[PDB]
Design a protein around this ligand. Structure first.
Ligand SMILES: CCCCCCCC/C=C\CCCCCCCC(=O)OC[C@@H](O)CO
Ligand SMILES: [Cl-]
Ligand SMILES: [Cl-]
Ligand SMILES: [Cl-]
Ligand code: NA
Ligand SMILES: [Zn+2]
Length: 466
């Protein structure tokens, strides 16, 4: 629909801007115990943000808010706000009085100086949760009114404040981007405060229990799917200092091709399932093909060009050649799972599309359990790269479960796409001559052209018919 395209525009801007935030992190801080500390401090809010944000709450909030009429709707809203305010307040109190609990939750293995600094920053990040939660509620209200572009854009506020703090980091140090994180949350809330403050306030949580009853199922899938990144970070804290920062650089960069190829391309087609349930198996079939068509070649390219890509974006200022080597290898480790997490995401969102919460949940559980196990075994011994690989392998396991669940997969088109991807690989390999920092961009363009040529050869009849 119109709102999906608009949503992609808003999200695209916010994520590219986010990338610039990370790039400046590499420039001004590189890999350091202090950036580790900053990451630990912001993880708790960010964990909460990612869980609730981008309309996660909406799924349960929309039906219960929109249905009500009169000032019972206003009462409902106030009930939710008050309830969450209670939980949040408890959290912030606990944070201030037992910061070692929070620190150990996210960075148990980090060094002494890192933990001290992370406490200091925690004092600044803790209040952000309240504003993030209010931002999430406000967001939902907007979704009831079918406004999607501007809410989707608000994350850019946070990115700009953090960026600015990074620019001021040469004057104030690590605390500047932390205060920027805080202020960023505040301005994100104020940007859409009107959706909340127009209604009246009632001193009650009367409807909060019902809201929790309905919300809980979507909450559990968000927690389980997200908890993995917390586990990854926690585990790598036990490796040499700077590991958290390595993993954050690699994963934040990795989230661009994942978000673009493993999720976004499959959105449009997936919409059909919601409107045409009777043909789910057929529609799902198509979706999978779409996913593969993008994820398999990308992976190849990303792996073949991981080092030059990483060097182009990150190797400035404090970020050093050693950091490029290490981060590039981590990025490969994540990228090996790209097609598997694409398939995973497609099947999961389709099941969600036919009102099935059980299977996506179970798959999430398998992936999370596997990732914790493999993070222990491989992460502790082999550090960041081991953690990333654990994530990818876990993805493979989840894919096997889901594939045995839906009992359908486009084998023929998988083979054709893999073949075209290896032709592409062969051509880009042959063209690896100049060894110039800017050469990889050309190599991507060449690769795209090769891949589309041979795809058009192997899909001639499909292009003609359509
Ligand atoms: C947009 C406006 C601001 C973006 C965030 C900039 C944040 C400004 C950072 C100032 C700072 O770090 O001061 C340190 C001392 O006050 C604490 O000891
Ligand atoms: Cl950040
Ligand atoms: Cl209710
Ligand atoms: Cl009710
Ligand atoms: Na992992
Ligand atoms: Zn109620």
């Amino acid at each position: 629909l119109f709102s999906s395209i608009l949503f992609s525009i808003a999200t695209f801007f916010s994520r590219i801007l986010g990338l610039f935030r990370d790039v400046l992190f590499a420039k001004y801080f590189g890999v350091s115990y202090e950036l580790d500390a900053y990451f630990i401090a912001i993880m708790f809010p960010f964990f909460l943000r990612k869980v609730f944000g981008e309309g996660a709450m909406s799924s349960a909030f929309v039906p219960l808010y929109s249905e009500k009429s009169g000032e019972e709707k206003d009462k409902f809203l106030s009930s939710v706000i008050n309830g969450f305010s209670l939980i949040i307040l408890a959290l912030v109190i606990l944070s201030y009085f037992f910061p070692e609990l929070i620190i150990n939750l996210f960075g148990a293995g980090s060094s002494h100086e890192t933990k001290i600094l992370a406490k200091k920053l925690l004092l600044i990040t803790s209040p952000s949760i309240y504003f993030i939660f209010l931002w999430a509620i406000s967001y939902s209200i907007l979704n009831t009114n079918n406004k999607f572009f501007w809410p989707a854009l608000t994350p850019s506020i946070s990115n700009i404040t953090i960026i600015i703090g990074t620019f001021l980091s040469t004057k104030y140090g690590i605390i500047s981007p932390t205060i920027g994180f805080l202020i960023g949350s505040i301005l994100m809330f104020f940007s859409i405060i009107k959706s909340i403050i127009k209604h009246k306030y009632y001193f009650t949580i009367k409807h909060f229990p019902h809201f929790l009853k309905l919300f809980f199922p979507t909450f559990m899938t968000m927690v389980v799917s997200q908890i993995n990144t917390v586990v990854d970070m926690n585990v790598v804290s036990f490796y040499d200092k700077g590991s958290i920062s390595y993993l954050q650089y690699a994963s934040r960069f990795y989230l661009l091709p994942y978000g673009l190829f493993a999720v976004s391309v499959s959105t449009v087609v997936l919409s059909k399932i919601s409107n045409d349930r009777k043909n789910f198996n057929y529609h799902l079939n198509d979706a999978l093909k779409t996913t593969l068509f993008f994820t398999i070649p990308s992976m190849v390219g990303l792996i073949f060009l991981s080092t030059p890509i990483i060097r182009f974006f990150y190797e400035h200022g404090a970020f050093t050649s050693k950091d490029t080597l290490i981060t590039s290898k981590i990025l490969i480790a994540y990228t090996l799972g790209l097609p598997f997490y694409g398939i995973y995401s497609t099947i999961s969102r389709s099941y969600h599309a036919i009102k099935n919460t059980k299977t996506p949940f179970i798959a999430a559980t398998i992936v999370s359990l596997s990732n914790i196990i493999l993070d222990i075994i491989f992460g502790l011994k082999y550090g960041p790269i081991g953690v990333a690989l654990a994530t990818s392998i876990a993805g493979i396991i989840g894919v096997l479960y889901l594939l045995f669940s839906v009992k359908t997969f486009p084998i023929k088109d998988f083979l054709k796409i893999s073949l075209n991807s290896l032709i592409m690989l062969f051509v880009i390999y042959l063209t690896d001559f100049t060894d110039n920092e800017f050469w990889f961009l050309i190599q991507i363009l060449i690769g795209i052209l090769v891949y589309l040529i041979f795809s058009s050869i192997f899909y001639r009849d499909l292009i003609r018919r359509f």
